[PDB]
Design a protein around this ligand. Sequence first.
Ligand code: ATP
Ligand code: ATP
Ligand code: ADP
Ligand code: MG
Ligand code: MG
Lengths: 219, 278, 352, 440, 50
Amino acid sequence: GDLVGVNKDSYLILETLPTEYDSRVKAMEVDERPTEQYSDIGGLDKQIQELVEAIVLPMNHKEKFENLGIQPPKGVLMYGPPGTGKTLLARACAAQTKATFLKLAGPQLVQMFIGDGAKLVRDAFALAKEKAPSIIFIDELDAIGTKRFDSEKAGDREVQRTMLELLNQLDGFQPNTQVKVIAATNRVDILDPALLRSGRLDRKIEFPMPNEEARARIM
Amino acid sequence: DVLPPEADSSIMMLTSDQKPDVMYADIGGMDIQKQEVREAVELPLTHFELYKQIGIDPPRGVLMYGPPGCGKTMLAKAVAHHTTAAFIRVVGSEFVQKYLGEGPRMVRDVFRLAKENAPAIIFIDEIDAIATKRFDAQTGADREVQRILLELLNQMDGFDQNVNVKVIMATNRADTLDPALLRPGRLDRKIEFPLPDRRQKRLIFSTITSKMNLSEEVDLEDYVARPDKISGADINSICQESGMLAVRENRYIVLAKDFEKAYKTVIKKDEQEHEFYK
Amino acid sequence: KQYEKSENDLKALQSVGQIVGEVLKQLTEEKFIVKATNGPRYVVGCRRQLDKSKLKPGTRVALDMTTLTIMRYLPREVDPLVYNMSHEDPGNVSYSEIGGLSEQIRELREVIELPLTNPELFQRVGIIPPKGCLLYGPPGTGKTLLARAVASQLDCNFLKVVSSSIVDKYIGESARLIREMFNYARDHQPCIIFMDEIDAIGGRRFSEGTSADREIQRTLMELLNQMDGFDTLHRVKMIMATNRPDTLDPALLRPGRLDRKIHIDLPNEQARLDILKIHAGPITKHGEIDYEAIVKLSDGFNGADLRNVCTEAGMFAIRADHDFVVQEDFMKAVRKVADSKKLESKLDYKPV
Amino acid sequence: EVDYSATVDQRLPECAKLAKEGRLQEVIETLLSLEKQTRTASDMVSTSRILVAVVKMCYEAKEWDLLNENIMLLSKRRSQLKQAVAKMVQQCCTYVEEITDLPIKLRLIDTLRMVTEGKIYVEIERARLTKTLATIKEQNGDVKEAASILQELQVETYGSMEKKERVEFILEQMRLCLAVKDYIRTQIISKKINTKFFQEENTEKLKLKYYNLMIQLDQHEGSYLSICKHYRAIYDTPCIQAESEKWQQALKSVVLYVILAPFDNEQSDLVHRISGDKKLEEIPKYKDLLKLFTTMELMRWSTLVEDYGMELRKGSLESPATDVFGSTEEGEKRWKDLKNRVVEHNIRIMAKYYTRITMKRMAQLLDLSVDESEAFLSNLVVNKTIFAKVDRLAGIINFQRPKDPNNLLNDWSQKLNSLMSLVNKTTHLIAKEEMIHNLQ
Amino acid sequence: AEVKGVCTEAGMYALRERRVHVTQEDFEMAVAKVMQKDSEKNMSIKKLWK
Ligand SMILES: Nc1ncnc2c1ncn2[C@@H]1O[C@H](COP(=O)(O)OP(=O)(O)OP(=O)(O)O)[C@@H](O)[C@H]1O
Ligand SMILES: Nc1ncnc2c1ncn2[C@@H]1O[C@H](COP(=O)(O)OP(=O)(O)OP(=O)(O)O)[C@@H](O)[C@H]1O
Ligand SMILES: Nc1ncnc2c1ncn2[C@@H]1O[C@H](COP(=O)(O)OP(=O)(O)O)[C@@H](O)[C@H]1O
Ligand SMILES: [Mg+2]
Ligand SMILES: [Mg+2]
């Protein structure tokens, strides 16, 4: 499966080439490194504590987890009414962490042809694995993570197949321990149980509408 | 240069190491089905001086349809094992290929090889892959599949009634098939393979347990009499699980207790309807 | 050494490749019909000092570029996809890491391992050992864990695939890959083929649908004919895991393809206790730990949730800046995971 | 998982003391409790020890009903250990060997068989128990029942049993079936034995027994060629070859049965091979008989009976006779068969030489009446042994097949080809002679 | 369709009996087969609807 450059006529291997990833998967990577400090988020302290302690801490202070003999949390899901500060916290985490960040969107994974969505999901996880410690952020998860139902209407089955591939990548054969995941959803009542499991999206952080103090801090 | 009749890529059954190992005796009952199948693709080969005398025409092919697991492919394997004619086994999903033209080319090659080997049988399993009635003619994939089906119909109609080339096709969903296939001259014999009744169940149980040990305390009549709608695969699985329990308990003899437990395991009853009805 | 390497490089530069083809038929002693993978078919010769008895109708061959002469016969090709399937790494999970599943382990082993070590028992009884199993149950019960344990602790060849990954956009390629996978198994007997998340391609075949639907049903038909068709499989076993057994084809669930339907349900009290012990063993615990209370509070949990209990207890300890866990941390963790469970629909489906 | 070795070691002697004192019931209750605990813990060694000790305690009390009930209950105990049951059955088999009373032995053996029916771990024990039961039945005087009991077994499948034991069981089944007069069943059983077995290290007595049984089976209906082959196999054994008398009898039987066997390619090859043996000299008269039957010349029944009549039938003290031609009805039948063999040999020779003969002359040369000779020749023709056509009106027997023009022309062509080859060979010889005698 | 099929079935039954003419008994057996299979298909459809 490697990629090698060969002579045009002799067909002799002359150079081993870097792996190949889809243009979309390559665009999924973050190069501008947003600039939003945690201080710019007001009203969310428990949620920020949970997200950092689940994502950033394992990467830096892995010694604590190794000593305590407990596996780090696998996946963080952020849910709440719109405008409660989810993509903002994702941007803040990307800004403050210096590991690879793979921004992604739910509808970005739904593709015309059959199998292309699963191909994209697996290629994205492969790129994250290749590039050192990494974070994958799947915003608008509800686009592909909707509940499975026995219906005669096609089209939904393709997104279901992409969702199954995503589930396998998150947790399954060949455990992954170098690529974390952050997910944001406006709706959790429609998400599939297999996607809300405890081995894939362990920490489900609720983002409530701000209170009086939160509103004052935001203003 | 003119090469020998066929180079071909659709190989023929080697009939020496690829020949199935299913006898006619290994099958239990299905006497009517065996008669019809061995008549529609051997009787025209024989006789033929009685077939026109009465104004009926010999059938070009046979369609075996029935529930999922009542002997279709097993009978196909039996006829392949016990027939001297050339055998060309195919599955419908093999015809569909990426590059346009390859599918019709494969169909034509199959039928040409059958023609070259004069007494030959063409067996296509799961024809629903090609012969689906519905179609979306604005895709290209569906158009190519329809092209494959049309080429198959053309080839099957292009027979001179003087070559012993018969076509057998097994389909679990005979309703979904395009009527063109059932049109006369094409597939004409429709053989049903229904779930065994009491007598067929008894015969299947006997023929499958004739190889096991089956201590005398086992009375297969009690299991035959039970009113459960089961297939030959179900019966074979009952016997297989009885043997598995015997092996687990480390015995070379099968007991009625094992048979009862295997029946319960394999004929698992559906959810019971509530009693406030009835 | 540098000059040896340079000389080797210079010598290797002046070497031309060889076209790879398939032999369709031998016409005479020095005439073969060969089909290059490109598509065209040629009449070609054969190198004299070559065992021509080994150029059967289907043998892969290396052809000279200029004269197209047959210069070598090669073993059957293994697709890089199938190689990747076979070369997965399921950690090193052992059967002791699985708790609460004893009967199910026994049944799965009876199907896959026992016929590959002691065929004599089955021969004596007079039954052909069963082929396939179907691991169905609520999420997080241990189906993939069981598959990983089998792959790690057993000695036969293993082929792990995801049904969602089998699919391809081009027409017929999914069926082609299934055929290649089963040919690989047949060649490298004995083999276990593990199709995780089967419902991706195995679903009830509708009458009214779309082109993509019909393509997936064609893939499923190819799979079914491979599992049980004109050619028997003999020493190739199958394991399939699905969270939704109800939406499966009766042909695929037929007791000739998936002989045993193993049910991996949510853990009982004892299963919960065993899972908790397994996942809390490696933690540095100070003070008496009463697993019974955690078990009583963890009703309706799965193995993943019981592991998350330990993980959250460790996280609480890390937050407190402690190098050990305590029963209070465990209780807090079980309460946290129990609260989290409210966002999931608790329902199971059966193979009906 | 939880060892009970210390507990079992500490407890068992106390239970034995109490049992010998007379505390049978209490001791059995306590040992049953201990066995339940050990089985639950999955302690194989502890369970086996408890079971064997309990059986021994019940045995050294002459409590036969207690022994039987205990064995059945402990075999049927839920989740019992197969190794423990095997050890208990082995000890009980030793006890059954030791016991002497007939009905008690019968009941214990029956209970053990019922317990061990259909179980891989205990199958050699069941086979041995069935053999003992069949022996007891035969000694009591039920040969039919013994044969049925021993035939019910299927020894060729038991993979644990050794080859020696399997062969012994098969041979015993063959002997019992022959004693009960079931020859089809005897042949079916005998098919199991692989003759290659009697070559490894010690398959001498078994080989002799099997070959003697096969000789009896074939001789039942007349299989002279196979009987000769069996006798050759017997004669080949070093044990028989060591002693002069045994190998002499074996060779006598081999020669006699090869003579008696009807003519065919295999019979001719066997006769030639037997004749090509140096040991035959010690049996001079039998070698003369073999030469008589191998030479292609007419032989007379009266002359044969005069010369070898007594040696092959009654015998002499220096060379004892054989049961081949004894005074029994079997011997009378074999003598008649030898006469028929002589007649057939004469007919074959007078067909090899002779294109046409008269029926009177054929009868005069076969030493039979015209009607008897006609019947013999007709039977041979119908059976397809020889070709002949009887012209009853003229009394002529024609031994030459019809000659087609194709056949005549083919014979002429073959003669021409042979002539050309001979001319070439003669030319080669002439060239050699000229080379040798011409240079000088 | 049923009337068309019964004729072919009667012809095939005459073929099996190996005579060049169809018989009244052949037609009776042909109807018994075709009408019964049609009823079987109808009841199968009814069960599928159920
Ligand atoms: N708690 C907060 N503190 C400060 N700014 C906030 C907070 N919540 C939301 N905002 C502001 O909301 C604006 C947009 O919010 P954003 O899109 O990140 O929210 P969201 O929860 O991800 O939304 P949605 O559910 O619509 O996807 C940002 O400018 C951010 O400044
Ligand atoms: N009469 C019978 N005697 C013995 N075995 C039988 C019989 N009928 C069915 N079977 C069992 O059927 C199993 C195979 O089923 P078969 O190949 O006939 O499937 P099928 O009906 O063609 O399948 P599908 O409808 O899914 O295409 C064999 O294992 C055999 O045990
Ligand atoms: N019975 C169990 N014993 C131990 N761990 C389990 C069990 N069930 C689930 N797990 C946990 O779940 C993860 C694997 O999920 P698994 O249950 O094998 O697949 P699925 O969730 O699809 O059934 C592992 O990380 C493991 O810790
Ligand atoms: Mg957002
Ligand atoms: Mg089939």
